[PDB]
Design a protein around this nucleic acid. Structure first.
Ligand SMILES: [Mg+2]
Ligand SMILES: [Mg+2]
Ligand SMILES: [Mg+2]
Ligand SMILES: [Mg+2]
Ligand SMILES: [Mg+2]
Ligand SMILES: [Mg+2]
Ligand SMILES: [Mg+2]
Ligand SMILES: [Mg+2]
Ligand SMILES: [Mg+2]
Ligand SMILES: [Mg+2]
Ligand SMILES: [Mg+2]
Ligand SMILES: [Mg+2]
Ligand SMILES: [Mg+2]
Ligand SMILES: [Mg+2]
Ligand SMILES: [Mg+2]
Ligand SMILES: [Mg+2]
Ligand SMILES: [Mg+2]
Ligand SMILES: [Mg+2]
Ligand SMILES: [Mg+2]
Ligand SMILES: [Mg+2]
Ligand SMILES: [Mg+2]
Ligand SMILES: [Mg+2]
Ligand SMILES: [Mg+2]
Ligand SMILES: [Mg+2]
Ligand SMILES: [Mg+2]
Ligand SMILES: [Mg+2]
Ligand SMILES: [Mg+2]
Ligand SMILES: [Mg+2]
Ligand SMILES: [Mg+2]
Ligand SMILES: [Mg+2]
Ligand SMILES: [Mg+2]
Ligand SMILES: [Mg+2]
Ligand SMILES: [Mg+2]
Ligand SMILES: [Mg+2]
Ligand SMILES: [Mg+2]
Ligand SMILES: [Mg+2]
Ligand SMILES: [Mg+2]
Ligand SMILES: [Mg+2]
Ligand SMILES: [Mg+2]
Ligand SMILES: [Mg+2]
Ligand SMILES: [Mg+2]
Ligand SMILES: [Mg+2]
Ligand SMILES: [Mg+2]
Ligand SMILES: [Mg+2]
Ligand SMILES: [Mg+2]
Ligand SMILES: [Mg+2]
Ligand SMILES: [Mg+2]
Ligand SMILES: [Mg+2]
Ligand SMILES: [Mg+2]
Ligand SMILES: [Mg+2]
Ligand SMILES: [Mg+2]
Ligand SMILES: [Mg+2]
Ligand SMILES: [Mg+2]
Ligand SMILES: [Mg+2]
Ligand SMILES: [Mg+2]
Ligand SMILES: [Mg+2]
Ligand SMILES: [Mg+2]
Ligand SMILES: [Mg+2]
Ligand SMILES: [Mg+2]
Ligand SMILES: [Mg+2]
Ligand SMILES: [Mg+2]
Ligand SMILES: [Mg+2]
Ligand SMILES: [Mg+2]
Ligand SMILES: [Mg+2]
Ligand SMILES: [Mg+2]
Ligand SMILES: [Mg+2]
Ligand SMILES: [Mg+2]
Ligand SMILES: [Mg+2]
Ligand SMILES: [Mg+2]
Ligand SMILES: [Mg+2]
Ligand SMILES: [Mg+2]
Ligand SMILES: [Mg+2]
Ligand SMILES: [Mg+2]
Ligand SMILES: [Mg+2]
Ligand SMILES: [Mg+2]
Ligand SMILES: [Mg+2]
Ligand SMILES: [Mg+2]
Ligand SMILES: [Mg+2]
Ligand SMILES: [Mg+2]
Ligand SMILES: [Mg+2]
Ligand SMILES: [Mg+2]
Ligand SMILES: [Mg+2]
Ligand SMILES: [Mg+2]
Ligand SMILES: [Mg+2]
Ligand SMILES: [Mg+2]
Ligand SMILES: [Mg+2]
Ligand SMILES: [Mg+2]
Ligand SMILES: [Mg+2]
Ligand SMILES: [Mg+2]
Ligand SMILES: [Mg+2]
Ligand SMILES: [Mg+2]
Ligand SMILES: [Mg+2]
Ligand SMILES: [Mg+2]
Ligand SMILES: [Mg+2]
Ligand SMILES: [Mg+2]
Ligand SMILES: [Mg+2]
Ligand SMILES: [Mg+2]
Ligand SMILES: [Mg+2]
Ligand SMILES: [Mg+2]
Ligand SMILES: [Mg+2]
Ligand SMILES: [Mg+2]
Ligand SMILES: [Mg+2]
Ligand SMILES: [Mg+2]
Ligand SMILES: [Mg+2]
Ligand SMILES: [Mg+2]
Ligand SMILES: [Mg+2]
Ligand SMILES: [Mg+2]
Ligand SMILES: [Mg+2]
Ligand SMILES: [Mg+2]
Ligand SMILES: [Mg+2]
Ligand SMILES: [Mg+2]
Ligand SMILES: [Mg+2]
Ligand SMILES: [Mg+2]
Ligand SMILES: [Mg+2]
Ligand SMILES: [Mg+2]
Ligand SMILES: [Mg+2]
Ligand SMILES: [Mg+2]
Ligand SMILES: [Mg+2]
Ligand SMILES: [Mg+2]
Ligand SMILES: [Mg+2]
Ligand SMILES: [Mg+2]
Ligand SMILES: [Mg+2]
Ligand SMILES: [Mg+2]
Ligand SMILES: [Mg+2]
Ligand SMILES: [Mg+2]
Ligand SMILES: [Mg+2]
Ligand SMILES: [Mg+2]
Ligand SMILES: [Mg+2]
Ligand SMILES: [Mg+2]
Ligand SMILES: [Mg+2]
Ligand SMILES: [Mg+2]
Ligand SMILES: [Mg+2]
Ligand SMILES: [Mg+2]
Ligand SMILES: [Mg+2]
Ligand SMILES: [Mg+2]
Ligand SMILES: [Mg+2]
Ligand SMILES: [Mg+2]
Ligand SMILES: [Mg+2]
Ligand SMILES: [Mg+2]
Ligand SMILES: [Mg+2]
Ligand SMILES: [Mg+2]
Ligand SMILES: [Mg+2]
Ligand SMILES: [Mg+2]
Ligand SMILES: [Mg+2]
Ligand SMILES: [Mg+2]
Ligand SMILES: [Mg+2]
Ligand SMILES: [Mg+2]
Ligand SMILES: [Mg+2]
Ligand SMILES: [Mg+2]
Ligand SMILES: [Mg+2]
Ligand SMILES: [Mg+2]
Ligand SMILES: [Mg+2]
Ligand SMILES: [Mg+2]
Ligand SMILES: [Mg+2]
Ligand SMILES: [Mg+2]
Ligand SMILES: [Mg+2]
Ligand SMILES: [Mg+2]
Ligand SMILES: [Mg+2]
Ligand SMILES: [Mg+2]
Ligand SMILES: [Mg+2]
Ligand SMILES: [Mg+2]
Ligand SMILES: [Mg+2]
Ligand SMILES: [Mg+2]
Ligand SMILES: [Mg+2]
Ligand SMILES: [Mg+2]
Ligand SMILES: [Mg+2]
Ligand SMILES: [Mg+2]
Ligand SMILES: [Mg+2]
Ligand SMILES: [Mg+2]
Ligand SMILES: [Mg+2]
Ligand SMILES: [Mg+2]
Ligand SMILES: [Mg+2]
Ligand SMILES: [Mg+2]
Ligand SMILES: [Mg+2]
Ligand SMILES: [Mg+2]
Ligand SMILES: [Mg+2]
Ligand SMILES: [Mg+2]
Ligand SMILES: [Mg+2]
Ligand SMILES: [Mg+2]
Ligand SMILES: [Mg+2]
Ligand SMILES: [Mg+2]
Ligand SMILES: [Mg+2]
Ligand SMILES: [Mg+2]
Ligand SMILES: [Mg+2]
Ligand SMILES: [Mg+2]
Ligand SMILES: [Mg+2]
Ligand SMILES: [Mg+2]
Ligand SMILES: [Mg+2]
Ligand SMILES: [Mg+2]
Ligand SMILES: [Mg+2]
Ligand SMILES: [Mg+2]
Ligand SMILES: [Mg+2]
Ligand SMILES: [Mg+2]
Ligand SMILES: [Mg+2]
Ligand SMILES: [Mg+2]
Ligand SMILES: [Mg+2]
Ligand SMILES: [Mg+2]
Ligand SMILES: [Mg+2]
Ligand SMILES: [Mg+2]
Ligand SMILES: [Mg+2]
Ligand SMILES: [Mg+2]
Ligand SMILES: [Mg+2]
Ligand SMILES: [Mg+2]
Ligand SMILES: [Mg+2]
Ligand SMILES: [Mg+2]
Ligand SMILES: [Mg+2]
Ligand SMILES: [Mg+2]
Ligand SMILES: [Mg+2]
Ligand SMILES: [Mg+2]
Ligand SMILES: [Mg+2]
Ligand SMILES: [Mg+2]
Ligand SMILES: [Mg+2]
Ligand SMILES: [Mg+2]
Ligand SMILES: [Mg+2]
Ligand SMILES: [Mg+2]
Ligand SMILES: [Mg+2]
Ligand SMILES: [Mg+2]
Ligand SMILES: [Mg+2]
Ligand SMILES: [Mg+2]
Ligand SMILES: [Mg+2]
Ligand SMILES: [Mg+2]
Ligand SMILES: [Mg+2]
Ligand SMILES: [Mg+2]
Ligand SMILES: [Mg+2]
Ligand SMILES: [Mg+2]
Ligand SMILES: [Mg+2]
Ligand SMILES: [Mg+2]
Ligand SMILES: [Mg+2]
Ligand SMILES: [Mg+2]
Ligand SMILES: [Mg+2]
Ligand SMILES: [Mg+2]
Ligand SMILES: [Mg+2]
Ligand SMILES: [Mg+2]
Ligand SMILES: [Mg+2]
Ligand SMILES: [Mg+2]
Ligand SMILES: [Mg+2]
Ligand SMILES: [Mg+2]
Ligand SMILES: [Mg+2]
Ligand SMILES: [Mg+2]
Ligand SMILES: [Mg+2]
Ligand SMILES: [Mg+2]
Ligand SMILES: [Mg+2]
Ligand SMILES: [Mg+2]
Ligand SMILES: [Mg+2]
Ligand SMILES: [Mg+2]
Ligand SMILES: [Mg+2]
Ligand SMILES: [Mg+2]
Ligand SMILES: [Mg+2]
Ligand SMILES: [Mg+2]
Ligand SMILES: [Mg+2]
Ligand SMILES: [Mg+2]
Ligand SMILES: [Mg+2]
Ligand SMILES: [Mg+2]
Ligand SMILES: [Mg+2]
Ligand SMILES: [Mg+2]
Ligand SMILES: [Mg+2]
Ligand SMILES: [Mg+2]
Ligand SMILES: [Mg+2]
Ligand SMILES: [Mg+2]
Ligand SMILES: [Mg+2]
Ligand SMILES: [Mg+2]
Ligand SMILES: [Mg+2]
Ligand SMILES: [Mg+2]
Ligand SMILES: [Mg+2]
Ligand SMILES: [Mg+2]
Lengths: 275, 48
RNA sequence: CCGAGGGUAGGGCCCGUGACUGGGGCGAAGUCGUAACAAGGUAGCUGUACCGGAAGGUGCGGCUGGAU
RNA sequence: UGGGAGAGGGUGGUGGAAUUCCCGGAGUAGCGGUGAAAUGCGCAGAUACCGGGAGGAACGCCGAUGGCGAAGGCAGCCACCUGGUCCACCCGUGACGCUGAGGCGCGAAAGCGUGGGGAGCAAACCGGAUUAGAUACCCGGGUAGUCCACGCCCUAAACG
RNA sequence: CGAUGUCGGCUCGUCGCAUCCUGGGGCUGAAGAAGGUCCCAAGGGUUGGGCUGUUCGCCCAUUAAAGCGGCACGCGAGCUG
RNA sequence: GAAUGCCGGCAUGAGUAACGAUAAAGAGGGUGAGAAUCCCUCUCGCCGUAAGCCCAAGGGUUCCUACGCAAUGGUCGUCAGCGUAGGGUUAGGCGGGACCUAAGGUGAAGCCGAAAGGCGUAGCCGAAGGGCAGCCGGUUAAUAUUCCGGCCCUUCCCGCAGGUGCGAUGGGGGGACGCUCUAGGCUAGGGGGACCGGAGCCAUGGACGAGCCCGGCCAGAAGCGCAGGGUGGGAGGUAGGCAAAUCCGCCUCCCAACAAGCUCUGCGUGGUGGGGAAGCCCGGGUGACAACCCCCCGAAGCCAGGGAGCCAAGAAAAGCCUCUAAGCACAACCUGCGGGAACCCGUACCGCAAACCGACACAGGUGGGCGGGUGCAAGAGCACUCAGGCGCGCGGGAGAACCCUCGCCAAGGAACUCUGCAAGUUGGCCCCGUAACUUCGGGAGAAGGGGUGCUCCCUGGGGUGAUGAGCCCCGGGGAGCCGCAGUGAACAGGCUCUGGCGACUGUUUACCAAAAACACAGCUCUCUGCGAACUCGUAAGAGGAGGUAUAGGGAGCGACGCUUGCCCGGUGCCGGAAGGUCAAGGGGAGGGGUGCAAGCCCCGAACCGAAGCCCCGGUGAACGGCGGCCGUAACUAUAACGGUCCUAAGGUAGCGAAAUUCCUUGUCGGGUAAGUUCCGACCUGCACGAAAAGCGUAACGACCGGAGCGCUGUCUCGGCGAGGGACCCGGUGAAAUUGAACUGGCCGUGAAGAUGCGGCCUACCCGUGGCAGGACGAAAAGACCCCGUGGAGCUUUACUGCAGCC
RNA sequence: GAGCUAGCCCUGGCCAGGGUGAAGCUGGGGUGAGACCCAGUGGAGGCCCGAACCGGUGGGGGAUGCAAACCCCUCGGAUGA
């Protein structure tokens, strides 16, 4: 339940922060953090290649166990639910009876104190990771590989889901979070449940400051620039686009489809997305 | 106000030093040219 | 010291009046259409929503104070 | 105390019919629609039929002039949770009752916010007709919304 | 055009007279008072305010009167801007 | 002889401006050829969260001493950051290296690129981050945590003794972390003392005093004392920490758990080593056997890796510990002791500045620490003062205009003016009180008031201590006293009403624009299924992102509230396996050349032939667009109503003479004595209108309007006064400019505005203070305007290519 | 050439003092339980006043300047984008 503030500043008026009702451990696992190196949107040539990046809060990267087929048939306990600043989802800490410790992203309804397991035999229960072919048709699912043994790839943001629609050959049919229907191989792993923290979409950043906290520098409208900078540059006063609305680089930002038409995954997209 | 020249021994040698010149093609040509002209100094004096 | 009252400031109530604006009542013989009273020629009323020169219309749900 | 009937309410589950849509087959010069039409759709292969898939909402027969509820209102089926109500026995308390300004709660539809959902239906709106006109009735489309969650609204021919 | 700074204001004047006032007059449809019109006259004077960047103009309150023009539409090596 | 020519030299302006913060000076005595300027003294003034002190960077001898005064110093100079010379910087512990990693850099493996080169994991490099052993005093003209004294400590080597499965780049633990707020106890620092030590002092009317003045400490090894941090112990199992592993991780059991036990810090004490004032008299010495004690305040620093809350979730690696592998257990490690060993570089001095960045000894710029007291609510604010440091490297006069900075002003009080521009008013605190509206926070310091000093008396709580005294932080009551006046000096809001624009805090044209512009949460559309899209790159490779549609890219709109209408004909985009058009290619009716001939060679029609275009659809918070004439009502007027032409459709809601209205100062209304502005209305909207959003909107605003109150030198309308200049004298001494000049007025004339021509008038020669009408004055080869088959930025359905994509 | 300037990355540092007084918490009220109410505690915030620090609104000065952007009075931000 996202929390409101009283209007004791202009920004507190609408600003909303997460409930955090599920976090049980407030400092991370020292053995499972790396220095997350901030780019600022700058590539290896040093160029701003992705714009309006930088200046956000310092973070450590939490290593997340995105395979889980490492540890078939080894039950792990959920010791904690932790805050991760690298993703929207929450993360769960796993003490395997092995003694090995791992983070997975935390599904919805998962409770500290319960036990999860990975493998072809696992119960169809929230938090267990199985190949796609063994999960029954119709069960919602997340952290879904896209190619066998290549790592969980889809439905990893908070609140999201994927649903197993049908089977066909060595392939299962998934309704991804975007509403498209795709073929994914059956040996691809997936984890029972949706991702927790759905209330995430209902957060109101309330002021420009929180955007700067997230590493989001201020975005500038192309209409506000000069023609040397952008297709919408200039005019005397305000000015309609006066040409098909274009990106900074020339291409048309309204409608213009951009996927590769000859991409081999076309033989595996069944239907483009929704809404 | 704050002016353009803010000396900095580490900056001076690292940007214009002999080693910074030797690394790059354009650096060597610098050193070659200033040798051909006969400069008493091939890089800035910086104390270290 | 209290003290009629006077002054300064800010409030609350009331009455009169105001360019213009909102509908309302009434007014022998204006203009428009015909919504209602018959199944009134789309049964009608209704609360609501949207819409239309106007009466009204349509959606939803309800009433019979509806007809055969 | 022991029983009975019931769409009373809330949650989760889940079954089949029909509509639309998508896919495969098969098949061809029309389908649709009306008072008659036309817009519409169809040789870029529709309609009509078979198989396949997804999705939503609404629950045929039973179904009644019936039942339940305080009223609004509640109808596939399953289980959980919960109200009222009636009856029998004549066991207990001993007038503890009636009503009820205020207050509180509930309260069809439509509507409003924030999420989701979207088949069918459909204000608005567009088109075709009709007409003197037709901002209608009739026809082809069609956005809210109808549906889910939570929070508002608190109206009614909320009627016996 | 190897630059003659351009509106308005303020400051400071000075000049012209086709005279707003004051002085002298003739004519009058000048009884008086008060006007009208024309002639002589540049000595002096010719206000304060509201609006507008304004010059102008309109208004307010006055006044003997609230003149009109020239001076690089006088005056930015004088100010304003 | 001219090129605003080039190089140099030298004039003019001119003994002119100026001589760089208005913190300020005067005198005596020295020194010397010479003194406002150097030295010394006394007096005066200035800074004192600095204008004092300590680091850092940068500078690089500038430091100290003797010896100098040509140049440098804005004057002077005997002085100097100047000239000549000599001297001067001392470390195992300070900083850096022989340690560690960060971004980044580099880069065995590898990848890529015509060459040059670009990448890249490890590893290496890389610091103000981590790690690491010295504190106090004395000493030099000048270095001192460095020399020296006192007391401490680190590592390396080697020996000895005891102990132990020893052993590492390997494994693990740890190092190891944000923000706000913060406890307990200390220390830094400070205040007081009637106690302690001191050279003395008694004034000018009083005081020989519980008088005045000064000072009353600092460092310290082990023990101990107080305060904290860190820290479970054992056993069994164990499949994980890429070999192993008694360590670590996971599970089970007893045990110990506000404890404690151990360990590590800070503080105090602590043998001991130091320090020690005013004042007096040549930095010295004395004081002095100096004393070195008590009470209070009290850190933002310390204990610390402390506690709490929060969301935006807060480095790495080494040291250090633990685990074992090869190995080795005659070794090796651990502890303790002893001896020995311990390198390189920096260390002068300036350092908010005369030594650094600004060409200058330049009112500018420069990161960190210390920054004492009193009073004012507090404070690093303000006034004044300690320590300390300065009086700003031209002076002496005079007492004009004018200028700057400043003070006051009779009556009036915005009449000033583009505008109350500016300057007044107001001003902190405590108390009383406080409106519309509102998103319930606010608006609010709204507004408007009362209080404020000093004396005496009575008293409530809090901190220390003890529960008292004392000290100390908040108060309360009563009676009084003085002045024009008690935040008595200094620092310290003018208020209100009402529109427009933008929600807001923010951002911006460095150096003429801070705004209504940008941004902003928020809203919508669109792309993207991951080797994503998109971006940068020839590529490799990066970013995106070690993210995954609740995500990321692009675009417009811009909190919020109520809303966002009609047109898809055209352009775009989206969909469309048919048709049409369409290149290379295929195909080869048929011809052509040549050869005696097989042949060789050439041209070539039908038809098959992608993308794109055509065509069919969709699509507006995609590019965009949203009519004209005529007629009609029983006064008139006007048309709810109709007629017809056109369109892809003819502007809905809301708003409107507006940040938009041309006619225009539209008209009507309010305000005003008077109102082209303002506000409220009306609607013939030249030419509003719905995400280039439409209408509102509390709060906000150095935004732009209109009004009022207060108060004023803004004004009528000016006056006087202050200082810095101007002025005069001594010193130093520029500048733009400049064809030469022996350079008057009028009316004319002249290339059409004449000192220079004509005519006339006027005029002795040369200066000084002033003022600006002229020299079409000066600085600038007009920036407006045009011309050049000049240039550049930008645009697009101009032309033609190219990247990219298909 | 990024020793100025713009943005970002790594690592450090700075922000006197006063004022307002969110959530939560505890108690108390209320209730069937709740909501909510009151007091206290608490110490939130692109909160309020104001130094340092960062700015550069208005005006005056300066204009061959102390300065090729300065000086004075005034004013904006000052725990945060
Ligand atoms: Mg909120
Ligand atoms: Mg609220
Ligand atoms: Mg949570
Ligand atoms: Mg680590
Ligand atoms: Mg990266
Ligand atoms: Mg790189
Ligand atoms: Mg590079
Ligand atoms: Mg480069
Ligand atoms: Mg980008
Ligand atoms: Mg960026
Ligand atoms: Mg998270
Ligand atoms: Mg994410
Ligand atoms: Mg697959
Ligand atoms: Mg969102
Ligand atoms: Mg962040
Ligand atoms: Mg923007
Ligand atoms: Mg622009
Ligand atoms: Mg622009
Ligand atoms: Mg550019
Ligand atoms: Mg271009
Ligand atoms: Mg362009
Ligand atoms: Mg444009
Ligand atoms: Mg513009
Ligand atoms: Mg325009
Ligand atoms: Mg523009
Ligand atoms: Mg537009
Ligand atoms: Mg256009
Ligand atoms: Mg375009
Ligand atoms: Mg593209
Ligand atoms: Mg898709
Ligand atoms: Mg600068
Ligand atoms: Mg320079
Ligand atoms: Mg600098
Ligand atoms: Mg350096
Ligand atoms: Mg350095
Ligand atoms: Mg450097
Ligand atoms: Mg170098
Ligand atoms: Mg380099
Ligand atoms: Mg070479
Ligand atoms: Mg040489
Ligand atoms: Mg040289
Ligand atoms: Mg060089
Ligand atoms: Mg009285
Ligand atoms: Mg009286
Ligand atoms: Mg008639
Ligand atoms: Mg009807
Ligand atoms: Mg009828
Ligand atoms: Mg009817
Ligand atoms: Mg009819
Ligand atoms: Mg209708
Ligand atoms: Mg066919
Ligand atoms: Mg569906
Ligand atoms: Mg009985
Ligand atoms: Mg209701
Ligand atoms: Mg409803
Ligand atoms: Mg039609
Ligand atoms: Mg007809
Ligand atoms: Mg000219
Ligand atoms: Mg010239
Ligand atoms: Mg000129
Ligand atoms: Mg004037
Ligand atoms: Mg007369
Ligand atoms: Mg008469
Ligand atoms: Mg007469
Ligand atoms: Mg006269
Ligand atoms: Mg005027
Ligand atoms: Mg004029
Ligand atoms: Mg006019
Ligand atoms: Mg008269
Ligand atoms: Mg008159
Ligand atoms: Mg005139
Ligand atoms: Mg003339
Ligand atoms: Mg003229
Ligand atoms: Mg003219
Ligand atoms: Mg001027
Ligand atoms: Mg002028
Ligand atoms: Mg001039
Ligand atoms: Mg010649
Ligand atoms: Mg030349
Ligand atoms: Mg010459
Ligand atoms: Mg020359
Ligand atoms: Mg020359
Ligand atoms: Mg010369
Ligand atoms: Mg020479
Ligand atoms: Mg010369
Ligand atoms: Mg001379
Ligand atoms: Mg002169
Ligand atoms: Mg001068
Ligand atoms: Mg002078
Ligand atoms: Mg000067
Ligand atoms: Mg000064
Ligand atoms: Mg002064
Ligand atoms: Mg003297
Ligand atoms: Mg003297
Ligand atoms: Mg001298
Ligand atoms: Mg001398
Ligand atoms: Mg002097
Ligand atoms: Mg002296
Ligand atoms: Mg004396
Ligand atoms: Mg002080
Ligand atoms: Mg130097
Ligand atoms: Mg000399
Ligand atoms: Mg000399
Ligand atoms: Mg000499
Ligand atoms: Mg000199
Ligand atoms: Mg000299
Ligand atoms: Mg000088
Ligand atoms: Mg001498
Ligand atoms: Mg020395
Ligand atoms: Mg030592
Ligand atoms: Mg060595
Ligand atoms: Mg080369
Ligand atoms: Mg390096
Ligand atoms: Mg290193
Ligand atoms: Mg270091
Ligand atoms: Mg050290
Ligand atoms: Mg020591
Ligand atoms: Mg010392
Ligand atoms: Mg000596
Ligand atoms: Mg031994
Ligand atoms: Mg041992
Ligand atoms: Mg061992
Ligand atoms: Mg850690
Ligand atoms: Mg870490
Ligand atoms: Mg750190
Ligand atoms: Mg935070
Ligand atoms: Mg101490
Ligand atoms: Mg004190
Ligand atoms: Mg001690
Ligand atoms: Mg064991
Ligand atoms: Mg094991
Ligand atoms: Mg002695
Ligand atoms: Mg601090
Ligand atoms: Mg600490
Ligand atoms: Mg690292
Ligand atoms: Mg062995
Ligand atoms: Mg042996
Ligand atoms: Mg060595
Ligand atoms: Mg030294
Ligand atoms: Mg300074
Ligand atoms: Mg100095
Ligand atoms: Mg200094
Ligand atoms: Mg110098
Ligand atoms: Mg000086
Ligand atoms: Mg200076
Ligand atoms: Mg002191
Ligand atoms: Mg104070
Ligand atoms: Mg001075
Ligand atoms: Mg000074
Ligand atoms: Mg001076
Ligand atoms: Mg004089
Ligand atoms: Mg006086
Ligand atoms: Mg006065
Ligand atoms: Mg007044
Ligand atoms: Mg007055
Ligand atoms: Mg006025
Ligand atoms: Mg102005
Ligand atoms: Mg004042
Ligand atoms: Mg004050
Ligand atoms: Mg009011
Ligand atoms: Mg109020
Ligand atoms: Mg008000
Ligand atoms: Mg309001
Ligand atoms: Mg309120
Ligand atoms: Mg007040
Ligand atoms: Mg007194
Ligand atoms: Mg104030
Ligand atoms: Mg703004
Ligand atoms: Mg703006
Ligand atoms: Mg707004
Ligand atoms: Mg905004
Ligand atoms: Mg600017
Ligand atoms: Mg500029
Ligand atoms: Mg500039
Ligand atoms: Mg400016
Ligand atoms: Mg601007
Ligand atoms: Mg501003
Ligand atoms: Mg801007
Ligand atoms: Mg913007
Ligand atoms: Mg919005
Ligand atoms: Mg949306
Ligand atoms: Mg590119
Ligand atoms: Mg290449
Ligand atoms: Mg990545
Ligand atoms: Mg907004
Ligand atoms: Mg905008
Ligand atoms: Mg269109
Ligand atoms: Mg179309
Ligand atoms: Mg179209
Ligand atoms: Mg084709
Ligand atoms: Mg168009
Ligand atoms: Mg257009
Ligand atoms: Mg509408
Ligand atoms: Mg107008
Ligand atoms: Mg209008
Ligand atoms: Mg008007
Ligand atoms: Mg308007
Ligand atoms: Mg307009
Ligand atoms: Mg006009
Ligand atoms: Mg008017
Ligand atoms: Mg009026
Ligand atoms: Mg108006
Ligand atoms: Mg009109
Ligand atoms: Mg516009
Ligand atoms: Mg638009
Ligand atoms: Mg508006
Ligand atoms: Mg407003
Ligand atoms: Mg407002
Ligand atoms: Mg503002
Ligand atoms: Mg502003
Ligand atoms: Mg005004
Ligand atoms: Mg006013
Ligand atoms: Mg006034
Ligand atoms: Mg004056
Ligand atoms: Mg004076
Ligand atoms: Mg004289
Ligand atoms: Mg002289
Ligand atoms: Mg000289
Ligand atoms: Mg001559
Ligand atoms: Mg001559
Ligand atoms: Mg002459
Ligand atoms: Mg003359
Ligand atoms: Mg002429
Ligand atoms: Mg002439
Ligand atoms: Mg002459
Ligand atoms: Mg002559
Ligand atoms: Mg002649
Ligand atoms: Mg002549
Ligand atoms: Mg003559
Ligand atoms: Mg004359
Ligand atoms: Mg003279
Ligand atoms: Mg003069
Ligand atoms: Mg002149
Ligand atoms: Mg002049
Ligand atoms: Mg002139
Ligand atoms: Mg000329
Ligand atoms: Mg002139
Ligand atoms: Mg000239
Ligand atoms: Mg110039
Ligand atoms: Mg030229
Ligand atoms: Mg030229
Ligand atoms: Mg020219
Ligand atoms: Mg020029
Ligand atoms: Mg021209
Ligand atoms: Mg041409
Ligand atoms: Mg030509
Ligand atoms: Mg050209
Ligand atoms: Mg060009
Ligand atoms: Mg370079
Ligand atoms: Mg930091
Ligand atoms: Mg601060
Ligand atoms: Mg307060
Ligand atoms: Mg409180
Ligand atoms: Mg709390
Ligand atoms: Mg603030
Ligand atoms: Mg305040
Ligand atoms: Mg300024
Ligand atoms: Mg001012
Ligand atoms: Mg200037
Ligand atoms: Mg300044
Ligand atoms: Mg000031
Ligand atoms: Mg701010
Ligand atoms: Mg502030
Ligand atoms: Mg602050
Ligand atoms: Mg920050």
């Amino acid at each position: 339940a996202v929390k409101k503030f009283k209007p004791y500043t202009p920004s507190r008026r609408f600003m909303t922060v997460a409930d955090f009702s599920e976090i049980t451990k407030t400092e991370p696992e020292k053995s499972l953090v790396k220095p997350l190196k901030k780019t600022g949107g700058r590539n290896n040539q040093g160029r701003i290649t992705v714009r309006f990046r930088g200046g956000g809060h310092k973070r450590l990267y939490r290593i997340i166990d995105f395979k889980r087929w490492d540890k078939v048939g080894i039950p792990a306990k959920v010791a904690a639910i932790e805050y991760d600043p690298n993703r929207s989802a929450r993360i769960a800490l796993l003490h395997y009876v092995d003694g090995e410790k791992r983070y997975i992203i935390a599904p919805d309804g998962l409770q500290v104190g319960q036990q999860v397991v990975a493998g072809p035999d696992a119960p169809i229960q929230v938090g267990n990771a199985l190949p796609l072919r063994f999960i029954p048709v119709g069960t919602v699912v997340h952290a879904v590989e896209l190619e066998p043994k290549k790592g969980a790839k889809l439905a990893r943001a908070a609140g999201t889901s994927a649903q197993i629609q049908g089977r066909e050959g060595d392939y299962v049919i998934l309704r991804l979070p975007s509403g498209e229907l795709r073929k994914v191989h059956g040996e691809c792993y997936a984890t029972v449940g949706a991702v927790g923290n759905a209330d995430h979409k209902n957060i109101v950043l309330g002021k420009a400051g929180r955007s700067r906290w997230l590493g989001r520098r201020p975005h500038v409208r192309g209409a506000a620039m000069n023609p040397v900078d952008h297709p919408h540059g200039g005019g005397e006063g305000r000015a309609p686009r006066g040409r098909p609305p274009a990106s900074p680089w020339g291409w048309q930002t309204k409608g213009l489809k951009t996927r590769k038409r000859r991409k081999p995954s076309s033989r595996f997209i069944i239907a483009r997305r929704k809404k | 106000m704050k002016r353009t020249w803010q000396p900095n021994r580490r900056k001076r040698a690292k940007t214009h030093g002999f080693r910074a010149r030797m690394r790059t093609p354009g650096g060597r040509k610098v050193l070659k040219r200033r040798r051909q002209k006969g400069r008493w100094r091939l890089t800035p004096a910086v104390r270290k």
